[PDB]
């Protein structure tokens, strides 16, 4: 009654667990679909080291390092859409294509580096190649950049994946923060990206590539710039409420 996929509202047709099993450590192990796992079924998935609910809202706690005996890759613990049953796939110029949530960052982990914090609590994810050998891999990630270890306070929103990468660099805006409720709409549609928070378009770009094919939402707690770390128990936290996708 009380599952966090119940109280998110979310269901294996819609949503793949991305997630660990074991303690948290270099050791612990990812698993794309964490049904996968022994003695996990998807509507009583809970584990309060990485994903757990208190009947508001979702949390998404990700470790520098976790994982790290295995991948050196950015760890996440997060979901990637589904099309009843079938994985999600749909075009960025025909239609429109949105994900609506609720979120707060409650806290950033420390980069391999030691200076600075950061990580991405939604993407727009596309091919790895589209049919024109375009390596589109993440079209945006939706991130809080801030200090290592940051437990509250100011930080920045920073709109990264080739949207910005690829096509003049990453983006950053000032005047966010850590607890703090934010509604976050991301559209695509008519081949531009865009956010909107609190109900104000705060990026919006179009991307100039042909075939925008192949594309889906993600969203949870990807954490970023910790390729390589080692594991310290410095973690993010994100927690999502209200959530919804929305093709028309
Ligand atoms: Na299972």
Redesign the pocket.
Known sequence: GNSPASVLGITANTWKINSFIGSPGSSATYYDDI???????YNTYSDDNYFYTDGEWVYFKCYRGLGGSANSQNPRVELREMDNGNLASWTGDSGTHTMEWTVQVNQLPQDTDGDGGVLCFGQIHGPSKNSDGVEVDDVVRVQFIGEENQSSGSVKLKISGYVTEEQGGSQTFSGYSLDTTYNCKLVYSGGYVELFMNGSSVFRKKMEVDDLSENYFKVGNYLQSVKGASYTGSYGLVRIKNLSVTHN
């Open positions: 049904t996968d796992a022994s003695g996990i079924s």
